[PDB]
Amino acid sequence: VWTKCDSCGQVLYRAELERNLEVCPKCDHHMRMTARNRLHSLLDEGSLVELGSELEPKDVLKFRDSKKYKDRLASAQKETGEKDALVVMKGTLYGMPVVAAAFEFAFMGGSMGSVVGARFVRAVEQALEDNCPLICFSASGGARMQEALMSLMQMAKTSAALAKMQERGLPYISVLTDPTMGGVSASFAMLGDLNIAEPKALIGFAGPRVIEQTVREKLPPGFQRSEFLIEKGAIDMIVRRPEMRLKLASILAKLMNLPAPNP
């Protein structure tokens, strides 16, 4: 019950950190948060309804690099307790119906596979049939390499679903957590109406190592961080996690012309 913040090397009491939403009360470092806990914190109490819980990894390519891909899937499912990275949970936000999605970065690095795209499309469909905003918390290392193009094409599918939502005129706020790189930053994470991002979140398309290899130089200080991106225009605003719920509620109320949420 005594954890430590690696950024500052403190001895944060675990419950104190947990009730602050996994943010160090000393340096305000945003650490890992599980998808289910994040959705519970975001959405109201007692209104959560998970969606796309019937979808499971069904490896067909029979991939094997150094460990069996089925073994990797089973190990991740045992460690995280979730069938795949993305977790969708319909709910209500300050009395306003909403659909939210959250990545689980502990599941194979939060990579995007077929089930991730299928669950995202399920969330979009649920939002469309019952008109309500969509919120996504992207934490991914890219596209699932063990599924080859079956993961690459998930970019186009999610983008098309978002295009349908835009045609209908519904909001879609994309919260960019740490890290959000590869095929998730390039398909639907940076495709939202507002690209909110948490402080000091590593966001980009290609990882820093490949950029260093190609350029063979020193990257600019604070490269690909949220504070560096907002000056480059790729991020609409930066919002701290404890303030995320109220900020999102107010923004979605303003977009949807609903009365302001009660603080």
């Binding site: 690099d65 094409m153 983008s159 295009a163 045609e167 390039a186 980009g204 398309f205 490949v210 950029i211």
Partner: protein, 316 residues
């Protein structure tokens, strides 16, 4: 400059050139030299036929990167006429890595967008080795929107290692450019025919490859990441690329059975580099066939079919 495993073919071609020179030297022995040339040509044909009988995934990937191969400009020259090149995204600069324009396909006007690696080293460094900056994907989106405005079909060539992972390219929203291209391309009210000539992937190839009909040459690869990168991350080595290529399934016949692409365009013997004209003719015939059965559909029905096709990707 042929590949490592095509050395006998290069030697035979050099021998053919030498025999031609000898024939030009003399006049009283032309018949026998011509007969020998024909015999060696038949030998080369049979050798090429037998070598290509069983090619692995790494062999196909090497073929897709042959430093002698028709690029987008070559296909445009050999299968399209009256090509006017449009340059500039109107914001930052025009990316040489993507060459776009409007041309005619057997009289019908079409919009052409595709990557251009460049022939020699000078053009390769001028075009960033076919790796486009975000101002290339923004130009592609502008051209696609223009084509959709004037009821014009869109033809896309996908031949690039991937998006440029530079500091400047990353500062200017590479991810945003790719995402906007993917989102806008699913609502176009005109048929889109995409082919994967050469090497494509990493998501910077899908940015101009969300089309109604997806085609791929026999010896072309299309992967989420280059085999070298997959090997480096998973196999913990760079020399084990062929195992990664085999495991991923980056070859056209492998992708076809997954319901990921619509058809494969057979290539001339010895790859598309030996006889680019035949490859261009086959590609043109395939494009015409794809456009013929797409024009029957209405705009709304075409868009509905495109949307349903996207939702069917993957096992979930």
């Amino acid at each position: 400059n042929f590949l490592d495993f095509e050395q006998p073919i290069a030697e035979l071609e050099a021998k053919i050139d030498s025999l031609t020179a000898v024939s030009r030297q003399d006049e009283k022995l032309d018949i026998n030299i011509d007969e020998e040339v024909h015999r060696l040509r038949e030998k080369s044909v049979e050798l090429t036929r037998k070598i290509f009988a069983d090619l692995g995934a790494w062999q196909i990937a090497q073929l897709a990167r042959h430093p002698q191969r028709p690029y987008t400009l070559d296909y445009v020259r050999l299968a399209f006429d009256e090509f006017d090149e449009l340059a500039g995204d109107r914001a930052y600069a025009d990316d040489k890595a993507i060459v776009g324009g409007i041309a005619r396909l057997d009289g019908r006007p079409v919009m052409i967008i595709g990557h251009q690696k460049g022939r020699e080293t000078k053009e390769k460094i001028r075009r960033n080795f076919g790796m486009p900056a975000p101002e290339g994907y923004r130009k592609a989106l502008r051209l696609m929107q223009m084509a959709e405005r004037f009821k014009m079909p869109i033809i896309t060539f996908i031949d690039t290692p991937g998006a440029y992972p530079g500091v400047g390219a990353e500062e200017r929203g590479q991810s945003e450019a790719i995402a906007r291209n993917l989102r806008e391309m699913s609502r176009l009210g005109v048929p889109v025919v995409c082919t994967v000539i050469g090497e494509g992937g990493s998501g910077g190839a899908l940015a101009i490859g969300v089309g109604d009909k997806v085609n791929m040459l026999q010896y072309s690869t299309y992967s989420v990441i280059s085999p070298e990168g997959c090997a480096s991350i998973l196999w913990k080595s760079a020399d084990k690329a062929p195992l990664a290529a085999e495991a991923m399934g980056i070859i056209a016949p492998r992708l076809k059975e997954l319901k990921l692409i619509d058809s494969i365009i057979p290539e001339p013997l010895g790859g598309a580099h030996r006889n680019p004209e035949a490859m261009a003719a086959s590609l043109k015939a395939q494009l015409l066939a794809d456009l013929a059965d797409l024009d029957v559909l209405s705009t709304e029905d075409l868009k509905n079919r495109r949307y349903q096709r996207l939702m069917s990707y993957g096992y979930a």
